[PDB]
Amino acid sequence: VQYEILQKTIPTFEPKESILKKLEDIKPEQVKKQTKLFRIFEPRQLPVYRANGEKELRNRWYWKLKRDTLPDGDYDVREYFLNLYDQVLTEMPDYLLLKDMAVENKNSRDAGKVVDSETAAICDAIFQDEETEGVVRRFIAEMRQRVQADRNVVNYPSILHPIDHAFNEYFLQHQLVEPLNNDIIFNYIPERIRNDVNYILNMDRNLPSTARYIRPNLLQDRLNLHDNFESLWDTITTSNYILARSVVPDLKELTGINSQAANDCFKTLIAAMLSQRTMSLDFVTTNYMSLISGMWLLTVVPNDMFIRESLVACQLAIINTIIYPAFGMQRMHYRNGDPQTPFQIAEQQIQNFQVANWLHFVNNNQFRQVVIDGVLNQVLNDNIRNGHVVNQLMEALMQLSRQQFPTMPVDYKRSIQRGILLLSNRLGQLVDLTRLLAYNYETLMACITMNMQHVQTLTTEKLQLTSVTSLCMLIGNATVIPSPQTLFHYYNVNVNFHSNYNERINDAVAIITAANRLNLYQKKMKSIVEDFLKRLQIFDISRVPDDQMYRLRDRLRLLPVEIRRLDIFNLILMNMEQIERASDKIAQGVIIAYRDMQLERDEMYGYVNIARNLDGFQQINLEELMRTGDYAQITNMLLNNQPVALVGALPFITDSSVISLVAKLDATVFAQIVKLRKVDTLKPILYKINSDSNDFYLVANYDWVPTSTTKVYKQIPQQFDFRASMHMLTSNLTFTVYSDLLAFVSADTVEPINAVAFDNMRIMNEL
C-alpha cells in the first residue's frame, strides 16, 4: 500500500455572503438583564499634602475613573463618548431585580445586605482603615436593606457617583415591564379574531399580579419604504409573501383539471393579496377555459392588483373572442399603450344591462384603504365577500349563451357554450369559493401589525390560468379554515419582525442624532445603516449600494428619538465634559504666559502648575488647526513670546522633581513646533511638588513660593463624601417576565361544515 502527494496554492476568493434568515426562523429578542451596576468612577486612597507642600500623617479617598483609556484629540474623545453611549445601550436593561445582584454586608448593624459586590468591598476597606472617622463606620453599620412587601417594593443601599446614580436610576424608573393579567392575554390578540365565532379560545391558568410582560413597539413605518425604496419593498414583499404561503391550509378533496394547481392558485392569490405583491399571467390562447376562469378572477380580485400588460392581454383576448364576436361587432383596433384597458372602453360600447353593469363593477372594483386598530387594511367591496358577484357573472354568461354568433361558425359556438356551461354548472361552488377566499383572506389579514401598502412591485409571481381553472373546477362541500397555531405563529412572527424593525430604527436614529450633535465630521454614516440592515436578517447588505443607505439616513435624521435613548443622551451631554475633566493622563489645555506666574496649592498634589478658570488669555482651538494646517498664528505668537492658550485634549507627564522648575523646562516643549509643524508630539509638563520630590528641603528652608511659566488648564478630582455619595435604589420585589405570550392560550376551530361569515350565514353550503 502506498501513495504520493502534490498540492497547489489555490487563491481564496471570499464573498461577503450576507447571512439571511426567513421570517418564521427569526428569533424574537434576548432581554438584557443587568450585571453589576455600571460604575464609571470608584474611590481610591491618595496621599494629601498640607499647604506649604509637606505631608500629613493621614490619607484621603478621592473619586477616580475606572479604566483611564481616553484618547488624544477631541474627535477621538467624542468617538469615546459615542462608544460609551453604545456600551450603555448595550447594557440598558429591560427589567432587573436587585436581589439577584445583592450581597451581604459584613459590617452592618442588623446583618443586612447591599446592592453590589464592589459596594461591600469599599465598605469593608473603609471599615478596616485606621484613619477614617467613626461616623462613616456608624454609617456602614446603619446601611441595610429595607422591604415593604405590601407593595412588592425593596429599597437597597448603594455607594456610587451621582452620574452613575443618574444612569442606574433611569434604568430603574423606566424599565419597560407592565402588570400582566388575562385581559391582557386576550387584548394582545386582534379584535376581529376574538369577535369571530369560528374559533374558540381558553386558557388553563390564572396569572397573578406578580407577573409581567414586555409590550412590543408596534409603531408604524416611519420611513415610508413604499415611497421610492422599491428594491427593499420588493424584498420585504416577497419575504412576507413566502411567509403567507407557509400558513395557508393545503386543500382537501378538460386540459389541466388536476389538483396541486388549485392549491397553487389558492395559496398564490391570498399570499399576494396579503403581501400586496403584483402578479403577472401566462396563458395559452388555445385554452379558452383559461380565459373563462380569468373572467371570474378579474371580477373578484381588483385590477390594480395586477400588472398592466397581463390583464391588458387577458381582457383584450376575452373581448375579442367572447363578447364582440357574439353581438356581431368588429374584433377591436387596440393600441399597445392605450390609456384604457379593454373592459373600460367596452363598458360604454355595448348596450346590455347585465354585461355593462358587470364591466362597470369590474373596472371600478378596487380595494378600500381603511385604518382599523392602528393598522391599515385593504378591505374588499362587501359585495365580493358575500358571494354575489358570481350572480352578475353567470347572468352575463346566460345572456351570452342565448346569443347566436352571426359572424362565427357553430363549432366555435359549441366550444364556447360548452365551456361556459361547465362554469355555469358550478354556480354554488363558485359563490362558496369566493366567500371562502374572502373569509380566509380577512382572517389572516387580522394577524398583521405592519400596514399593508398598495404599490406595484418590480417583480411578479407567475399565475397560470390553468391553475385558476383547476381551482374553479375542483372544489365542493369541504371547508378549510386556518388552524389557530398557524394564526398565532403568523401573528408572533409579524410582531417580532415589526418590533425588530422599530427598535433597530430607534438604534440608528439615536446614533445618527448623536453624531450630528457632536460634530463627528470624519465619520461616514454608512456602517450604521449596514448594521441596521444586518440585524434585519433578510436583506442582501453586500449588494445594496451607498446612495440608498444615505437616502435612508436622510429620512432617519428627521425622526424623534425614543424616550430611553434621548434621556440617556441628555445625561451624557450634560456630563461628558465632567467625565473628561477627570482622567489624569490627558489635560484639557495649556496656558502659555511668558511671565513667572505662581503655582496653585492643592491637597492631592502639593504645588502644581494648574489653572481652572482660563480668564484673560485668548485661546486657540487645535482641531481647527489639525484640520486646516495654518501654523502662522501659533508660530508668530510663539516666536515673539506672545501669551496664548491652547485648548484641546493633550497628554502630559508628571515631573515630580524640583530642579526641572528653576531650569524652566515646560517652555522648552514648543520650539519643536516650528521645525516639525505637527502638533501631535506635544506633551506639557506638570510640576507636582511635595514632600516626595527628593529636593523639597529648598522649599522648606529658603521660604519661596514656587513659580512657573506655562500653566495647565485642568480641574481637580472631587473629594469622596461617604455620607452624601450613599443613595437608596428602589425597585420591585420578585416578579416574573414572560415573552411567548400566546403559550397560555389553547385554541380550536369549529367544524368546517359549521362555519359562518360576517353576514351570519354558513359558508360552503350551496350544492
Binding site: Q2, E4, P11, F13, P15, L20, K22, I242, R245
Partner: protein, 73 residues
C-alpha cells in the same frame, strides 16, 4: 446580425477547465444562489435536496484524483 456595421467575436474555451475562474468563485456563486432559493421556499424535502446539492459543491471545491503509476499512486 451580419453586415458591414456589426462584427462577431468567436472563441474556443475548451482548455478552460483548469482555469482560475472555474475554481472557487463558480462554486461559491452557485452556493449563494442555493442559499437564496432555500430562503425562497418553505417545504423541507426541497431544502434538504438543495442543501445536499450545495454540500456537493462544497465537497467538490477540494478534490483529489487517483492515478496509479506502477506501484505508487
Amino acid at each position: 446580425f451580419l453586415s458591414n456595421n456589426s462584427m462577431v467575436l468567436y472563441t474556443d474555451v475548451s482548455q478552460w477547465d483548469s482555469s482560475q475562474h472555474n475554481t472557487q468563485p463558480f462554486r461559491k456563486g452557485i452556493i449563494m444562489g442555493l442559499d437564496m432559493l432555500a430562503n425562497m421556499t418553505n417545504d423541507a424535502r426541497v431544502i434538504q435536496t438543495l442543501n445536499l446539492y450545495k454540500q456537493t459543491q462544497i465537497n467538490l471545491m477540494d478534490s483529489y484524483v487517483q492515478i496509479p503509476d506502477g506501484n505508487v499512486i
